[PDB]
Symmetry: D2
Subunit: 261 residues, 4 copies
Amino acid sequence: MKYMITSKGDEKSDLLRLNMIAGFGEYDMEYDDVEPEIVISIGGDGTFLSAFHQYEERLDEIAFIGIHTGHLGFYADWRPAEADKLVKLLAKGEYQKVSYPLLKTTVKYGKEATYLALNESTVKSSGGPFVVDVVINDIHFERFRGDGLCMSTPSGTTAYNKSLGGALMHPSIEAMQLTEMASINNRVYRTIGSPLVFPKHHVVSLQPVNDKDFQISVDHLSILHRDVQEIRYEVSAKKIHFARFRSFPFWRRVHDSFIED
Amino acid sequence: MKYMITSKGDEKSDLLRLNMIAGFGEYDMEYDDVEPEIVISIGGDGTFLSAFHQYEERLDEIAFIGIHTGHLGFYADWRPAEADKLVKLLAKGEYQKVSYPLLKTTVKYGKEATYLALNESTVKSSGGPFVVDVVINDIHFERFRGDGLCMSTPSGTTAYNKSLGGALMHPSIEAMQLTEMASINNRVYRTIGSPLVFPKHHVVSLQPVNDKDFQISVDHLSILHRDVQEIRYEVSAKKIHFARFRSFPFWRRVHDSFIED
Amino acid sequence: MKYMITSKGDEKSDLLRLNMIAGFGEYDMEYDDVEPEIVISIGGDGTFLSAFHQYEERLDEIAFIGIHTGHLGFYADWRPAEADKLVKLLAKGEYQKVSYPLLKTTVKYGKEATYLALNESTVKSSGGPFVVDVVINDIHFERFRGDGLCMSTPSGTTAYNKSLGGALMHPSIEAMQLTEMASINNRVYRTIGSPLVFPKHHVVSLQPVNDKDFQISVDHLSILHRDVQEIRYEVSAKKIHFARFRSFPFWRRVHDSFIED
Amino acid sequence: MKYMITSKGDEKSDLLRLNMIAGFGEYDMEYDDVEPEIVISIGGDGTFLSAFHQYEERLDEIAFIGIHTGHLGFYADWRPAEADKLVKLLAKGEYQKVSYPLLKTTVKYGKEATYLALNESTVKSSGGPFVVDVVINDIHFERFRGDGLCMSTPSGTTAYNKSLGGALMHPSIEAMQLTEMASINNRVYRTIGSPLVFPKHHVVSLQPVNDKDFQISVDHLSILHRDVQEIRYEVSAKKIHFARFRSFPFWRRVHDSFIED
Ligand SMILES: CC(=O)SCCCCn1cnc2c(N)ncnc21
Ligand SMILES: CC(=O)SCCCCn1cnc2c(N)ncnc21
Ligand SMILES: CC(=O)SCCCCn1cnc2c(N)ncnc21
Ligand SMILES: CC(=O)SCCCCn1cnc2c(N)ncnc21
């Protein structure tokens, strides 16, 4: 079918890309980066992340695969030595697919901007103090004062979420996790401190109290948003689809990354 | 129908119990503590916890209700002032029911002991060092050295799990969360550190490496188990059922308990 | 002697300032904000902080006093009701003095910039990834990857240091404390994680590895430094001097701020 | 002079001990384990710890040395390959000495028991809930509810203190550090959460509120104390003295243990 391959840019990934294309030519496979049904990433997790956001409007028609030319990645979890065997099974197809949940971020002004995050979305102030009111399902939960907040996807918990004390949750759980950055707590300012895991259809809303300028990141993308009235977080109805070739469990992927390999 | 009421034991809860029984007599309600269909707890969360374990063999036939004669509880979340209104709606029934997941703990020796936990189950050593191998779905994940481990239900995350840095997760998420107690980490001994959230059907297994004596707790119950070969944790197929009378959201219950009320 | 009074700017602090000046006129006291021997701050801790940095070149000749017109402060720890009694004892003098250690920050380029911090000094990247090599007494200790680092004075531990997990240490201990911001740790990148308390004469040096642009803060001041070769942290030889009128222990000041009051 | 050598018990340490004794016989050195002036530990940190407590009544007349026959230790910080060179310099003496602060623990009943801790002293309940009032310099600071508390020496911060989130402080700082174990915090029960570093002459006192039975540990020693009225913590006036042969900085010892070696 139609496919395309993105490369990190170094000669290790570029040469590995040219070989897979040459191997794909031996099969009924057409190269198309406009309407691909298979998107192959070669490099690391950031390369897969750019490949995800490059085609985040055709997610239901794409099965992603990641190849790590460096250290192991949670998305690029196939070594370069399996590139030739990957070409054959992708060519004749018949592969199983696995789907991970995604995070929807809605930014409201005085239009409306919506984003799709594979890892996480963070909110920080524009330099001044970061104070925000946290509203969970139209219920005022807390007034957060600190460095910022991070809402993470299940697969994104192994990234920035983990550095903030958040829990690692299996990606089959359709949920999102909110963690704090350097919250100030005294007798007068109260935050929950613990990470918060939210199921599907739960809407977490950040609302300003003073400054309406915030630095909002979505995976690698980061923009300074001005005159914002609300930031809405919820589990997205769309899912990223992977091509599954063999058993590489998420917990084994966690063990190899943080324990030993 | 058949009902029964447990009391904390103080005169505040005993008198509140006698009044609800007198009010129940004005309706088609029979008092039965052998086969009750309604179990009312009056006191706090520990009173509800003892009421849960007293009838943990008829969970599919019971709708629990908790009344807090002291501070607010996550299970006893109805004030004493609503006792009379609670009697009327329970009498004519028609109430909706909500179900929370439970934790199954299997202890294997050289028979087999299984427990049901509403909050959490902890494992500590018998005084000596606590070293254990953590196996996730038959995959050796880590060798844990420290004070102990805690596997928490979703509703149990607000209890001992929260004191260990674990995340608070909404009880509609059928999952369990594992947290560490004072793990020792150097270049030679590696633990994940982060809490781990496991979905349904995932089996987390603790296996000894030296001492086979461990102090295992299940909610309030705590026993010294000797000559144990394995501790199996997984989300239980059974659920505790509550009687629902009005909207008291879990996140509002979290806000009232830790933020302010 | 010579004195001056800074005000937060609100009418509560301005009127309290005009009254103390009028009360000071009843004594042998001259108002001088060029060479003051007594510096009175009226407002909060940020007002005292601006008053400290306004006169950080005559620290050995000044005894500072802080008055909080709002909530209690660790530097402005005297209520407005004690302003009149404060005027009398300052006028005839005979007051005891207490001294807190300070933090010296040296920034080396390709000249040299030195700063004095009463609370803390933080280092973050200019937007990109923050990677830095931590050198303790000319010994390479770790390569830090994360959001940034914070070196705190003893009295500064109750501020941003506390939000990062650092310990609160009594200000009589001439030392400094280093804490991490969202460090990334795996099998390949290793940080200590724990806070580090350094005694006097110990030099902690941050050295770039890639980007040489960092956002460095010193108390409230924050500047983007470009083409930096080294950031040197050490306990300063200079001390801030307070005027002591009665027993307000630091631990009682910690209790009143975070436990209850 | 007079010396003695303790061994871990394995054949690696016993044979290394017999060789140093044979090498000591070539010099003006007498073996005496009653009144030794040099105490050599061969094994790990627990072997040095037992050697410390074996002679904790002649601390001012002993210079300790630790040899690690296994992984590196913070007290046994000399490899077995340096045993012969260690024998020669100890024999002719002229070595410099370094001193680390110690922790004094006073347990008051209805007599009085005092202990000396090289690493830390912990307090836990006897099985029931652990609630205690924390009094700092006769000022009620907090009511602690949780698993327990740990007061650590400076050199002890790399041990159990580190697993509880406490800071690592250089041993030249005469101080002690208090850390919490799984404290419960809500709107009604308030603990500081942060670790607390106390200078010399500051007295931290734990006082019961209900149960007067606590499991108190002092380094490796652990005893169940009954009918206790007070636990007093303070920096001891006595110091443990080491024999210094070359530069092995504490921070390098921290780097080798937790970063890499
Ligand atoms: C410095 C930080 O805290 S973000 C590190 C990002 C590394 C690349 N990466 C991208 N996605 C992931 C992921 N899901 N899990 C771990 N690492 C990931
Ligand atoms: C000292 C500790 O860490 S356990 C405190 C237990 C208080 C009673 N309780 C019982 N169940 C719960 C619950 N689910 N959420 C919060 N509190 C609960
Ligand atoms: C949002 C943060 O983490 S910084 C809060 C700073 C409040 C004012 N202040 C200034 N100095 C201090 C101090 N030493 N101790 C506590 N608070 C202080
Ligand atoms: C499982 C724990 O948290 S205690 C581990 C004790 C290891 C031996 N040891 C004894 N003293 C020390 C010390 N000062 N620094 C590190 N390790 C030490």
